[PDB]
Symmetry: D2
Subunit: 291 residues, 4 copies
Amino acid sequence: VKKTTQLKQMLNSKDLEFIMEAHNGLSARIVQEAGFKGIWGSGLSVSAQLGVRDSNEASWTQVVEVLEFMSDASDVPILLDADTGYGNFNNARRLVRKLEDRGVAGACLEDKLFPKTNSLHDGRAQPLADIEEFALKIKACKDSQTDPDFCIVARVEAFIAGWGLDEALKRAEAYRNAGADAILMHSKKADPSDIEAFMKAWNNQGPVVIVPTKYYKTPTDHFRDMGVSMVIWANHNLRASVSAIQQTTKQIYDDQSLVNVEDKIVSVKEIFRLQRDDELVQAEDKYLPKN
Amino acid sequence: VKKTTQLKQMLNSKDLEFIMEAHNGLSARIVQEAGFKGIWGSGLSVSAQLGVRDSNEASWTQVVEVLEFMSDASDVPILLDADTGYGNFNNARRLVRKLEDRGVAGACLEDKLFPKTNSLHDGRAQPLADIEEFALKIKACKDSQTDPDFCIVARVEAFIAGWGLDEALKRAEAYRNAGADAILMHSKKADPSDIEAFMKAWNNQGPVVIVPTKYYKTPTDHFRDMGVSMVIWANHNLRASVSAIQQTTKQIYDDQSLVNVEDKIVSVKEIFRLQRDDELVQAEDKYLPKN
Amino acid sequence: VKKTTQLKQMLNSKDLEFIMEAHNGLSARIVQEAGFKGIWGSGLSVSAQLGVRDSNEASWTQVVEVLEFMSDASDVPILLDADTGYGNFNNARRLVRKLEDRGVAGACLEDKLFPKTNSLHDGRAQPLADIEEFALKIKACKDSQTDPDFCIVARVEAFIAGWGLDEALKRAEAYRNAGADAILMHSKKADPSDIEAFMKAWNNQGPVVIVPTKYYKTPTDHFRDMGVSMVIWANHNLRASVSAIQQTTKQIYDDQSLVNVEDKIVSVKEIFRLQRDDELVQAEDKYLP
Amino acid sequence: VKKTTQLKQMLNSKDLEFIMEAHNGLSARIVQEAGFKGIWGSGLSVSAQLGVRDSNEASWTQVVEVLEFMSDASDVPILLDADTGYGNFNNARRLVRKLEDRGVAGACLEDKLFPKTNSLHDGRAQPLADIEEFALKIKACKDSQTDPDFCIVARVEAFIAGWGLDEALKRAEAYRNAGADAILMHSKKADPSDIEAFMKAWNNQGPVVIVPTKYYKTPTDHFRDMGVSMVIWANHNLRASVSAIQQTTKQIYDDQSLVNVEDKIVSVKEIFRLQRDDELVQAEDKYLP
Ligand SMILES: O=C(O)C(=O)CS(=O)(=O)O
Ligand SMILES: O=C(O)C(=O)CS(=O)(=O)O
Ligand SMILES: O=C(O)C(=O)CS(=O)(=O)O
Ligand SMILES: O=C(O)C(=O)CS(=O)(=O)O
Ligand SMILES: [Mg+2]
Ligand SMILES: [Mg+2]
Ligand SMILES: [Mg+2]
Ligand SMILES: [Mg+2]
């Protein structure tokens, strides 16, 4: 069961699926250990851990390198938030090849311009890619694949860009017909209005993916009611990690002692176990001259 | 005030200094924001976030790349736990040049063999570098510097390797004479016995650095009593980050909702602020055609 | 002196300066030893040694690393041909900083869209960037540098695209007023007419850089007479390398032997010297018991 | 067929096979087109194009990326000269996996210590690894591969180091029993005596690979008669490239013109073809409105 196949099956499953954000090898392993069937390589969380902005500042090969360590450290599929493809169809298809090679299950591309701006920002230019063009990019990525099960998810930032339903629906149809394996309908509204609207008008033309970050209060079962195939928990490991580090850093700063953190944080032996140090020990005993 | 100078002054200060571990650009920014005058680029925390082991699995340029993002995102000096230098004096001095160029304040090298094993492990081969040799490596690094204030810290893993005080003291003296800017005396004992022993026998021949991880219960003021120049909080941001992600990942998994994490983790706007998104906005308004 | 200073001095000299193309650490060291005062970090050549197209396929950091090995191997400046900057102003300024830290001396940015298309191509569409946008991108780079001598060369593709003198001048004036340290007027024409027409109208507002690839018969003195501050031999070492590799590979493939190539190629000791292996020997003597 | 399979088939053929050295994407594509069935990823050449020494100065991942561009640009196999493996068995097995994923066909590891020293050097100390340790490292690689055809070539430096036939055989037998797919017996001698002495005692236990650099006058047929399965022309394209770059750079530097080099170097259109620019044109036609 290759990772691509897994991700393909989750997207194609009538049953509602869940992938969780990870932004590095360590968090990739954790998401997997918790039982999640999938991982979301958040464009924002990856750039965030690096300390840069979610606006194509890190190079795409740097994004892929980060993701390489993530693939190596996980057995479950990683869908990478690949922004706009980092350029035209050619940059797009080249990225798809690097992704397959590293074991990454799929890439998600958004109909915006390079470089992009995070979707959660209010009052900022959020210009769209010409529909017909973005579709060819979708198709060029699909055509370029070597692995049939690799997934290409198209993201309609129409609602995000302030446009209406007709626009969103138009784009979705265009990219699904272009071969996309699922359509990601985004919105920043605090309510599920836009999703409710698209889904109603979509008439199950294809698996749909959503990012409930801004309307988190919405009852999950409601997504099943609408018939969404997969939900993406987009950035909570990143956000929790900050709290923990800010709180821990503050506490250690103030007390100039480790006394007040030792019991609130994981042990050194838990780290060693997450790196699979026992496997090296096994191997060391096996490939190193006994004495 | 260059970063090297800062780190030089902290090491040389009679006053006890504190540097905190960071393992990526994001945590580097946080450690700085909390007020810390320095950052510890933990060999283990860096390899841990990548998902590999603290045994030279990631390449040194991958370690340096990680550290590059960290330097860019911080104004305070970063001392990098550089293991054994990733090879002989030549690999050592080449690393020192890359470090200067990226803005990194200094490198800490340990008298062990390549590839190394984390020091916190019990019952594992912890073979030492020939003293005279490691000293030349120290000297070759010092000689190679372009920036006079860059720091080279020598780490005596003698106590760690199970040897005694005479050995530790011998090594320390050898490397200090070789030019090192501070000696890092390590131990895994649950008590400060070894440090108390070295410091007593050292007679302030040079600034000494310590990693209190295993004897964290020891009263900090006691390090000042002994005359230690700097303490290193080696891996607590890494460990806290795991707790947070494991707990958060578990909670989201179980509830299939974001309802129970939203209030326990930092906000999306706090992330944007840690990436300094406002600076880009300023710049965007300034270098992008108004309309 | 400082590489950036070395290069700014060249762009501002009243003398026709020359910078040779290099595409990896090794060729950059050769150029250096040959006497050249500067190196042209050819995007085409750099992409070509990687076996990829001059179409922004290789990430901008991969190009940066290539140039890092190159800067490391030379004491003279390297002007990196950074295509259109690999993005918007933000991507450009991120580039300028890194390039600075890596020891590179300057960046030449061109006014086309990302991803770009090589200039010597015919029939291929060459879209031009908005003038203000590109000009604002030049300012941003100039404002972002931390070494006042690092040079930002603005490159006009108006001719390559198929437009006229009137269009080139307007773009060149705009970029120069934005803070460019020099203007590079390109042309794929058979003669120097485009450069002539421009140099004549330019009135020496700022240093002008050119690439004679397609009009290489123009006698060099003519550029001096036009006032051209710098010339770029942009891809000859790369083209030469290929010629030599194709032939040595053919000869060996056919002879199933090395006797017919060993006397037509530098020696292994020559490679060691180019790698400055002698320095390592002196160093091993100091730092190895 | 699969690159790894292509290469394993070559090491096991009863025929004397040849693999040519390449050091970047471009030369690898040239080697491919010339007809060669395999490419030798020369550590010396790879380090030399970077402008650095064959002394493990460039990280093992930087070498990997270089080879990635190389694998991407060729349909034939590439045997990477991975020096001593860049560390202990663990570092070696990490290497094998990456190399696999990048499409490389095999790795040749040598029994010296990290960081290594080029073999053609004289007087330089050449420390040998413990036999069991190195043999155990070979097993580890063989046990770690996920593509059964990926080949692990073990390289004996006993002669290069200055020891005798008796030492080479023992090391070669040990590594072969550990699972090596082939043994590479090196020698910097003026004649094939070392190879002779070894091939004779070897009794064809396994495929044997050689590098004729220093004894290039030996007629190739003699290797066939000795039973040698593969020969490596290890650095000629790199040495050729330098010769051509040194001369083209000299000529241009002196003429302050291109007329005397433009007729002695491949054309710009030749570079485009080598970059498979034609494929992009076909693609732009499909995927651009
Ligand atoms: O996590 C990301 O980077 C996303 O794709 C979703 S958003 O943050 O852009 O809304
Ligand atoms: O944090 C590290 O990697 C250290 O140098 C200290 S220890 O973890 O090795 O004890
Ligand atoms: O070498 C390059 O990429 C150049 O800048 C010159 S040209 O090939 O575009 O004419
Ligand atoms: O090209 C190399 O690095 C070789 O393996 C052959 S030798 O140069 O070491 O003889
Ligand atoms: Mg995103
Ligand atoms: Mg450490
Ligand atoms: Mg160019
Ligand atoms: Mg070699």
